[PDB]
Structures are given as C-alpha cells and as structure tokens.
Design a protein around this ligand. Sequence first.
Ligand SMILES: CN1C(=N)N[C@](c2ccccc2)(c2cccc(-c3cccnc3)c2)C1=O
Length: 390
Amino acid sequence: GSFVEMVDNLRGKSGQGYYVEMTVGSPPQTLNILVDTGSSNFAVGAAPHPFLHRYYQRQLSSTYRDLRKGVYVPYTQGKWEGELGTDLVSIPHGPNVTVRANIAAITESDKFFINGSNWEGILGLAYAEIARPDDSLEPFFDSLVKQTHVPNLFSLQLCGAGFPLNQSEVLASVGGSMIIGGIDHSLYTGSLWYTPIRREWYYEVIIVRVEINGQDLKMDCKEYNYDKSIVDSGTTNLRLPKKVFEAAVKSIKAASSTEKFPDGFWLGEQLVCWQAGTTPWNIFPVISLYLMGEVTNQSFRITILPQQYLRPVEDVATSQDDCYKFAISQSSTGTVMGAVIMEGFYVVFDRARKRIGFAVSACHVHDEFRTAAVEGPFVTLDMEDCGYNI
Ligand SMILES: CN1C(=N)N[C@](c2ccccc2)(c2cccc(-c3cccnc3)c2)C1=O
C-alpha cells in the first residue's frame, strides 16, 4: 500500500451511498460528499433542508465566485436545482492539493437528500459529456488533473459490512477507500484485469457473456448492453435490462429452487429473513459477468456471490434474524453495475488509459466455501458486436 493517507477515507453503505469528506471555500467548510461515478457535477446542499445538518454557505467564503447561471437537474425519482459558481476545494484524506472547481450550490431539491445518509452533496466523477447544464461545465476530476500533477486515474474499494449497521456503527465504521491518482495494492488480492471504456460519458463497458453458477444465460450479447452498460457507485443494485433481468431471475430461482421465495422478494421490495447465522448462502448461485478484454478476441470474468447480491437489512421487528433484500433489479436504461457489484471488487478508473480495472476486493464478504473472483483470459469472438448502437 503506497497511498496510506487515502486508505479507509470512505464511509457509508450500498443503500445510502459511500461518501468522502471534502472542504469547500475559505475558510474551509467541511462537508460529506457522495462518491458518484454515474454523474459529472459537483453539487452540494447550499440552503437549509430537513435532512441536512450542514450546508455550503457561499456568503462565508472569501473565494466564492458566482457564475450567474442556474442549473436544473430533473431525474427519474426526483430533482435538484441550484446556482453555479466556483470555489477552492480540497479532500482532507486525499491528495495534498487545493483546486478551483465548479460547484452547483443546491437551493431546491425533491427526493435527492436521504435522511440519515450523513452526506450533504455529490461528487460526480464521470465525464463532461453528461455534466449539467452542458459539457462546458468542467467536472471536478478534470479540474483536479488540469491544475495539479495528480495522475488521471482514481480507484474505489467499497466495503459492504455483510450485516446491518445501525446509525452509530455506520458513522464509526470504515466504508472503504477512494484512492485519487493511484492504485493501492493492499486493497485487492490476485490480478487486476482491464476492460476498455467504450466511450467517455458514463463509465461505459461491454458485457460479452453472463453465467449463473457456470450456466450460460445464452442471450444475444447485445441484450446485455441494451442500451448501455455502466459502472456506477451512485446506484445501489446490479440493474439489468428488462429481458436480461427476466432471464437472470428465472435462472437464479431455478438454482435456489430448494427454497421458495415470494414474488415481492424477487421484485426487490420485500425482505427475507433466516434465524441468526443460518442464511443458506450455498443454495444461491454465483453470477459471472464476462467483460471485453484489452487484447483482441480476449475476455475475462468477474464473479460475485449472493453475499454481494443479497443486501443486509435490519428486520422490521429488529429481531435477531439475518435479513436481506434481493439487490438485482430491472432497468429500461441498460445495465448498471452498482454498489452491490462494486463491493466485491477493487475498481480502477484508469481515465489516462481509457480502461476500467477489476480485482477481488480485500474487503468483500464471503464464506469458507466460495469467494468472489476475477479470472482470465477467455477466447471470445465478435465482442464489438455486443455493444449497442441507436
Ligand atoms: C443513479 N444515480 C446516480 N448514479 N447518482 C444519482 C444522481 C446524480 C446526479 C443527478 C441525478 C441523480 C444519485 C443522486 C442522489 C443519491 C443517490 C444515491 C442513492 C442511494 C444510494 N446511493 C446513491 C444517487 C442517481 O440517481
């Protein structure tokens, strides 16, 4: 491990997000910021809200610069709106640099802030193409690389606890690491395998084959990337395109058929509970996603366990049972490799080399019989045909 200052600088969990401490303004104003590889704006609460115990106060920052422009960000299940500006930004448990970055000061929002999440803003780490209002608003990471000698790469180790964390425990627990400008070898075991970044907007990748307990899902590979496949720390679940979700759920049900679960469980709505310590991990299958490799006609696979795709939740009766929600759900916007998938792996966002690296995480949850895996190579043909085009 060569980046000790950044190791263990994250807190949080899959369902509420993983956040890093940042400071904005002069004198510095400390805020907790959601690490989001699925968006490209640095946006912070800048007005009182019921779910925020602190927010950015532009009038107290001597370095605040008003861009005199509003930003409106409506999304599926909500929105945020604010005012654009710039200020001096630092990451205390990060590179020892201060940069001038764009900041969207959030003045109004609907279903954006989460009660008890402990974060007050979001760090959009994806590319300018998807920045709001448009690609002229330089994302934070682009500013950081342009203004300093920080290498154009970051890596994420998101650590799921494997069990529920109460309010006090989640504040006192280490949620993982965001290594800015490098790869820390203490965070993974085995080898790093790289997949190309198909296009620089979201962190888009190409899935070439899917297995459930070694059994090929046998769908046309274009289905797996319809209309795109992305790596997103800002999404909780592994999200699959409708048809892929339907085929995967049927195969996961068939593999776990020794126990019957209600439809509400498979819909990701209701929890399932087992007596403390008796979760039947072994009846649930492993899921392998094969990704396009860096060499022609070569792929590799990442394999996750039910310990990643069953999300620990506290029972409604706060009982001594071990309870979970199924953390795989359908999408109408392509595949999303969310936090529950990222929790299995150390993920390297190698922007400099337009590639994403995967290695087994040193903090993934497993049992004495199975572990997550990153393996290769495999001979795979016509992988370019797996990508979707509108
Ligand atoms: C899918 N996704 C995402 N990757 N970031 C969010 C977003 C970002 C910018 C603009 C609109 C939406 C987002 C926003 C707020 C909270 C979360 C969020 C919620 C729960 C667990 N982890 C993260 C995600 C979002 O909806």
